[PDB]
Structure 1
Amino acid sequence: EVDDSTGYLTSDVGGPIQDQTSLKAGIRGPTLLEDFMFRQKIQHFDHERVPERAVHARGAGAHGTFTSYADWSNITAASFLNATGKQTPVFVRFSTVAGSRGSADTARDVHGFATRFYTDEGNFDIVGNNIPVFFIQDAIQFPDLIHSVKPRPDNEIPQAATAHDSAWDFFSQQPSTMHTLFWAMSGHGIPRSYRHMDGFGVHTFRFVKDDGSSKLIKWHFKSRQGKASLVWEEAQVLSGKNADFHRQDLWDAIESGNGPEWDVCVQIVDESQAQAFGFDLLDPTKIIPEEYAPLTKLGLLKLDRNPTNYFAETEQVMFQPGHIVRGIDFTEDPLLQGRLFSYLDTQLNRNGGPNFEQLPINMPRVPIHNNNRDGAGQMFIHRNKYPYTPNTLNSGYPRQANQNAGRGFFTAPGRTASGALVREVSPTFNDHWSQPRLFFNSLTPVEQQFLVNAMRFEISLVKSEEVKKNVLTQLNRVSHDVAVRVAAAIGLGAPDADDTYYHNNKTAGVSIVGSGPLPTIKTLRVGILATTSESSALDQAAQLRTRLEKDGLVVTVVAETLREGVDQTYSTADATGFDGVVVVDGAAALFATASSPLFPTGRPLQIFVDAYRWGKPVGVCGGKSSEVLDAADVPEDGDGVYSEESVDMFVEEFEKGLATFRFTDRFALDS
């Protein structure tokens, strides 16, 4: 860390200098080539940027720690997991997928959840998503998926969105995508925060014990903050009002001592069970339903420290599935296999050179011993002047590590191969439709409506008639009902029911809206709509504040202008900024054709009405509260609408609404 809180300005080689005026040939003359102060500073500026990540360019990170719950020697040789209460430092970066840097956090996308464990046996990276399955079955197809999903290559439109022809052309021609597509079209596509989503390894990996035996595994990071998601119409506004929503949320949670947490869990099954669940476990388009393999809680992950410099830490972190440790191994998942190559190659693009592992954020916490030398940006001075093996001149050091010496990584010895070299897909990968259906069946009826509506939204923006038809064809194979309902929005006849993959199986834990109340409401945001006219209004506010802040909530008091007790103005305020909204009684004048030069017309009411329509806990607190609602057109008796005089009783009622989080009775269903 470099401190600049005191001192005189220096060049990068420590020579004291100034940087405010160019060196000129006379007071009104031209600037001089010999002005090295100028050129060193501008050169640095001219070269600040580096290529953004090819995918997951928009993201944010934090420091934390992982704690093991046990000695897991019975299942894996992995050292960071070998003792109860063992502590490994971590760094995590969350992201979207398609958007470039600067795109909004709250676009609809798959989300990245990438974890580095700086273990005492090397860096170990789990590079996963908030969705447990992926669009495609072979890594060689990645550029096709990504080209089709990103902006059209002729005009670069649309940013951060699948709502255009090519994406759906791809989805409709590459049915493997149905599963992930359904997930992305659910609320999983628009989580309320990084903290309110899970992490998944997606692929099957292997746990490996010192005796050389292996089990097949799946990583699950279960959120201790619970699952929650935005509604579309809200997410669109948020993208405009606050592109930085998710990163501001994570930053804030951590500043206030509310570091988010996840249970790091695995499903563990036997090598013999590769095909025992009615699908191939090498297929990254499938889940093992919790019904057929329960989760084992391995330890706790908690993020509790923000970075100091975003660029140096978050932008420069370079994850790799190739960052593996003794005790874990890969599987023959043809998607995972290709990933191994790509993440090592791409860092050359991003870093411009081969010594990217020497960046502080990418360094391990243990010593490095090998014969890698030179390359641009070499930061070490190696003492061993015989960097070859085998040598005698350095006494055969560094020594080869393997299964039996030095605690080397080693491939699971059980793993075998047979047959021809082939560029052919396994027939066991061929069912693209059952699991999407399983997923759909497992969502609440409102959740299902939302998903239909997301699909209605997107497909209607697909210009091509033919592409729309092929989309309907694929959707129909998952559910005729879904096809019918979607087809209705784009004025086409759904094709005739095809029941080859229809079924009524459900699975637990995939539903957001059906996962019951949040386990905590700490850090949720409450907006209090007040005024500077009635002296009573601000007093009501102040009292709500003390009561609500005591329960860990984040409180914003809104009024026409700022002053003591007021956090923001109506001008800068919006419903998307809040999880619940409270109007204090004394502000009734503002909600009734009244206008002000201090905010746009109708803003105070607009905030409230928006909050209500998006399914949020809304309420009026005070005496005439009965009446402010009829003016607002909000039903007094409605679920999650709150009307009370007793401050203590209002909070108590409201806090129950915050836990329910979304009031689903306000949304129309099909017929």
Structure 2
Amino acid sequence: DSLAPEDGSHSPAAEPTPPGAQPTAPGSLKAPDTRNEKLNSLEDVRKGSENYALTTNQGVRIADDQNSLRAGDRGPTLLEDFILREKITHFDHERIPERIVHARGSAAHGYFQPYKSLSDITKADFLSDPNKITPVFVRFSTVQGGAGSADTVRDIRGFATKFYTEEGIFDLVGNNTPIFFIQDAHKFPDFVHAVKPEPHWAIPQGQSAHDTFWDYVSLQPETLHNVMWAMSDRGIPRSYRTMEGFGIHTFRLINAEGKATFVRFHWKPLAGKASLVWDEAQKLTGRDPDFHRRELWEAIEAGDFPEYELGFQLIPEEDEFKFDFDLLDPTKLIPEELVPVQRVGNMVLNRNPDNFFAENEQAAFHPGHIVPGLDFTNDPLLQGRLFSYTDTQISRLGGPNFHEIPINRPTCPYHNFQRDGMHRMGIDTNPANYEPNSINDNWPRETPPGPKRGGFESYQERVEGNKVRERSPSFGEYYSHPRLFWLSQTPFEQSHIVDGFSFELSKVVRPYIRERVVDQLAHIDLTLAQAVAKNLGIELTDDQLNITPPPDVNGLKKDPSLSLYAIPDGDVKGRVVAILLNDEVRSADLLAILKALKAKGVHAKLLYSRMGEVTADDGTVLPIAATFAGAPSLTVDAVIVPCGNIADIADNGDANYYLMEAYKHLKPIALAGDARKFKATIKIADQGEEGIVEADSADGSFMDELLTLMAAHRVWSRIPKIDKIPA
């Protein structure tokens, strides 16, 4: 009755292994020794399987799970088949509503630890002691597309962290850009409806490249700042490991003396900032729509844990009005040149879930989940968010007991007088379900605020004004921040922004919308506006050419922290290289290549024209990971071709195209020995060029040169050469 292979090759090893080396597995089976308080607290609901009988949900052993009960083996199915009906009933009700936004997401467990106590500025318990470990659960996401949409779309990304603290759950629910599209939560359904698939036909999925989005943008210039970020390569990250995170809103820190400090939250990726290019990202949504989900899971299985440093921009209360923009305006960023990010702690994501639905799909994050030591501000976008994230769970998670779903449960105590509701798990023994009560001596009891372990009390901000539905005049400036962002990008990043706007507006069917957006760009920067207009066949008017640019932001003409690439920060660990094999590889090349990659934590994929094995010149049997077409260059960071019998692949269309695609997408390419014959395919001269590593063999400086290219991510100098490549 055993169907597993006798050699045990069905079971992945419970040790760190590189991508593709073993089948992927539930986190508690892949890494049982990786533990934290939250992971341990889930043991009471984990269900095994091995050596157990197959049963109904009522515990009745099933004898024949292959057949319905019928009157005769060719007869009608009988209503009394309760085993069939239970199994089909459960199947029939598997699906729950997806999230209204951020429905597509990928999640992992981990932990956070502060570098030093922050008790001088906040009484938040999780920040009080450098030895205090806080378990986390983090979900990364896109925004527009459904749960079944693709990863590498052009979109904002979500970055949501649930901190299981000793004084309550704190959810930091952020994105990968430092501002949002709109100012007031009342407009959120309008903006989201505009970006989402249009209501008549439900097209397009995972794309802002359609009329209604750009209609809204053209009529709501407050959106232009985040639109700039989305049209930049920020909109197409290489992986969730290589993007920044931001809380966007100004919040407050409250210390034990009651002093408030304004704060904006930041996540700094240890892996650096890195993005795809558009043609690559779009094609990758077809070749592997699960690319980011896959890369996150496989990095964790490899022991190559995503890490992010939490940082704070801190602004004293008395500095609230000292900026050109309003601190409470979520369409405005705080330039790091004005307010540095101060490092706070480090977060490591080190274990995948066991069951995606149970842990990822059912997780509920909400920015109103704060703890003593934190507080809100009057940011009118944040203010409305506070309503939505509790409300939405009533349908999505089936009722008000969503905190009892295991992934959502606090690890600290929780006791109150709330009762009942659908799916109620907790069985309360309190004689009282109300307070004040005498019959239980008033337990559970309120707790006064205090320095630690105290009750929550709001900061006593002064409120003065009339009841109005009115935007603050201080919010009424829309172009200076887009311009600061534009001016802070490298020339190639600027080209990619121009190309993002140009491509998206080309998909807008109504030309007047394109013209209205171009007019908005002319209020930001005329170089940007002219370049987009040229790609759309639009001529700017003399009046448009005379629009005065918006002022600098507090005297800044640029802030390099806004660029992905201006300040190098790339680390190669966790990247991957395609190695194009032939039927008689020079083994000395391959040894030098693979060992150099391994020493820097860079993975390799051995590719060929078929699956199976090839044998190297010295008899080494080389296992093939994928075909050239099965693992396209889109999925790797660089391509290496060792020497050997190059004639085997020299006329292979897929192998040649592999190099052309990688070349077009600015990736490093390295060619050893006779592999240099492939230079003709990519039209590279005999003398070579920067970004192509070549030598008689892969020894000496060959691998160091390639790894240096990989640390710089892409070969931007190659852009003028690709603009006429047929690929």
Please indicate the TM-score interval, normalised by the length of the shorter structure: over 0.9
My pick for the range that moved more, 554-563 or 376-385, is 554-563
SS in structure 1 opposite 2:657?
helix
- CA deviation string 1:64-107 (max 9, x = no partner): 00011111110000000011222100000000000111111000
1:275-354 paired onto structure 2 within 5 Å: 275-354=321-400
* Alignment equivalent of 1:129, drawn from 162, 172, 175: 175
Taking structure 1 as the reference length, the TM-score comes to 0.96
- CA deviation string 1:115-150 (max 9, x = no partner): 010000010000000001000000010011100001
SS in structure 2 opposite 1:667?
helix
CA distance in 2, matches of 1:517, 1:125: 28
* Alignment equivalent of 1:197, drawn from 240, 243, 256: 243
2:630 match:
572
CA distance in 2, matches of 1:583, 1:393: 79
CA contact (8 A) 1:625 1:644 kept: no
- CA deviation string 1:605-629 (max 9, x = no partner): 101111111110111112x344431
CA contact (8 A) 1:530 1:587 kept: no
* Alignment equivalent of 2:713, drawn from 648, 655, 661: 661
Q: Runs of 5+ in structure 2 lacking a partner?
A: 1-45, 614-621
1:250 and 2:300 are equivalent in the alignment: no
Q: How far apart are residue 517 of structure 1 and its match? A: 4.9
Q: How far apart are residue 45 of structure 1 and its match? A: 0.4
My pick for the range that moved more, 289-298 or 43-52, is 289-298
CA distance in 1, matches of 2:648, 2:245: 44
Equivalent residue letter for 1:410: E
Q: Runs of 5+ in structure 1 lacking a partner?
A: 596-601
SS in structure 2 opposite 1:278?
coil
Q: How far apart are residue 508 of structure 1 and its match? A: 2.7
SS in structure 2 opposite 1:89?
strand
My pick for the range that moved more, 348-357 or 214-223, is 348-357
Taking structure 2 as the reference length, the TM-score comes to 0.88
1:633 and 2:691 are equivalent in the alignment: no
1:104 and 2:150 are equivalent in the alignment: yes
Q: How far apart are residue 537 of structure 1 and its match? A: 4.7
1:550 and 2:608 are equivalent in the alignment: no
CA contact (8 A) 1:476 1:497 kept: no
Q: How far apart are residue 541 of structure 1 and its match? A: 3.4
2:616 match:
none
Aligned alpha-carbon RMSD (Å)? 1.6
2:568 match:
516
CA distance in 1, matches of 2:684, 2:205: 36
SS in structure 2 opposite 1:207?
strand
1:584 match:
642
**1:35–1:625 CA distance, 2 compared to 1 (3 A):** closer
Equivalent residue letter for 1:53: R
Equivalent residue letter for 1:496: L
1:491 and 2:537 are equivalent in the alignment: yes
Q: How far apart are residue 498 of structure 1 and its match? A: 1.1
Q: How far apart are residue 547 of structure 1 and its match? A: 3.3
1:173 match:
219
Q: How far apart are residue 656 of structure 1 and its match? A: 0.6
1:355-366 paired onto structure 2 within 5 Å: 355-366=401-412
1:80 and 2:126 are equivalent in the alignment: yes
Q: How far apart are residue 154 of structure 1 and its match? A: 0.6
CA contact (8 A) 2:585 2:642 kept: no
1:462 and 2:508 are equivalent in the alignment: yes
1:259 match:
305
CA distance in 1, matches of 2:698, 2:568: 26
1:536 match:
585
Q: How far apart are residue 515 of structure 1 and its match? A: 2.6
**1:591–1:489 CA distance, 2 compared to 1 (3 A):** farther
Equivalent residue letter for 1:515: I
CA contact (8 A) 1:538 1:565 kept: no
1:268 match:
314
CA distance in 2, matches of 1:642, 1:193: 25
CA contact (8 A) 1:541 1:557 kept: no
CA distance in 1, matches of 2:52, 2:332: 58
CA distance in 1, matches of 2:224, 2:530: 17
CA distance in 2, matches of 1:260, 1:116: 16
* Alignment equivalent of 1:412, drawn from 449, 454, 459: 459
CA contact (8 A) 2:152 2:282 kept: yes
Q: How far apart are residue 499 of structure 1 and its match? A: 1.1
1:598 match:
none
My pick for the range that moved more, 628-637 or 332-341, is 628-637
CA distance in 1, matches of 2:489, 2:645: 40
My pick for the range that moved more, 661-670 or 378-387, is 661-670
In percent, how many aligned pairs have the same letter? 45
SS in structure 1 opposite 2:145?
coil
Equivalent residue letter for 2:635: G
Q: How far apart are residue 591 of structure 1 and its match? A: 5.2
- CA deviation string 1:417-474 (max 9, x = no partner): 1110000000000111101100000000110001001111011111112211210111
CA distance in 2, matches of 1:536, 1:668: 34
CA distance in 1, matches of 2:277, 2:549: 33
CA distance in 2, matches of 1:170, 1:330: 29
1:442 and 2:493 are equivalent in the alignment: no
1:650 match:
702
